[PDB]
C-alpha cells in the first residue's frame, strides 16, 4: 500500500504529488531500507518521460519534445538529450543542422550470427542434464 502509490507518479508529470507521498509514507520507506531512492528517483522522473517519447517518435524535433513535457521551451528539451545516450537509453543521433533526434531499427539479429551465439550455451546446457542423468542412474 505505500509501494502502491510510489510507481504511479513516475508515469505522471506531477512531482509535488510524489513529494507528498514520500513525506506521507517515508517511515515505511525508511523501514524497508531504501533510503537512497529519492537522491536518484527525481533523476528518472524526467528520464521515464524522454524514453517514452523516443520510443514513440522515430524522428523528434528538439523544438516540440519540450512543450509536451510542460518544459516551456526548446532548450529545456535537450536538457535531457545528452546523457541518456551515454546512459544507454536511446540509439538516436542529433545533427546540428536540424536539431532533430532520429533513431534506427535493428534488423540483423537473424541476418547475422546472433542466434547461434545464444544456442551454444543452451546446447551445452541440455547435454549436461543428459550427463547428470546417466551418471546418477544405475544405483541399483
Amino acid at each position: 500500500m505505500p509501494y502502491f502509490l510510489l510507481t504511479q507518479a513516475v508515469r505522471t508529470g506531477n512531482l509535488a504529488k510524489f513529494n507528498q507521498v514520500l513525506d506521507q509514507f517515508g517511515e515505511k520507506f525508511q523501514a524497508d531500507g531504501t533510503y537512497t531512492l529519492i537522491i536518484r528517483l527525481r533523476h528518472n522522473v524526467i528520464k521515464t518521460g524522454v524514453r517514452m517519447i523516443s520510443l514513440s517518435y522515430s524522428r523528434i524535433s528538439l523544438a516540440d519534445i519540450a512543450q509536451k513535457l510542460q518544459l516551456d521551451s526548446p532548450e529545456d528539451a535537450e536538457f535531457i538529450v545528452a546523457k541518456a545516450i551515454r546512459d544507454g537509453v536511446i540509439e538516436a543521433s542529433i545533427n546540428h543542422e536540424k536539431g532533430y533526434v532520429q533513431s534506427k531499427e535493428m534488423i540483423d539479429i537473424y541476418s547475422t550470427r546472433e542466434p547461434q551465439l545464444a544456442f551454444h550455451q543452451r546446447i551445452s546446457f541440455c547435454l549436461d542434464i543428459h550427463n547428470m542423468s546417466v551418471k546418477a542412474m544405475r544405483f541399483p
Binding site: 510507481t7 521551451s73 532548450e75 529545456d76 536538457f79
Partner: protein, 40 residues
C-alpha cells in the same frame, strides 16, 4: 558533468494499457458468460 547543453531560452501495472484500454462495454459480460445454446 556536461549539463546537456542548451541555447534556446490508479495502479495499473500495464494494467493501464489494459484499464485505459477498458471503459464503456462489458459489465453484463461479467456474469453474462453462459445463456447461449438453445437459440444460438
Amino acid at each position: 558533468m556536461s549539463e546537456k547543453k542548451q541555447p534556446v531560452d490508479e495502479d495499473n501495472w500495464d494494467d493501464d494499457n489494459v484499464e485505459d484500454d477498458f471503459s464503456n462495454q462489458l459489465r453484463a459480460e461479467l456474469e453474462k458468460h453462459g445463456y447461449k445454446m438453445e437459440t444460438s
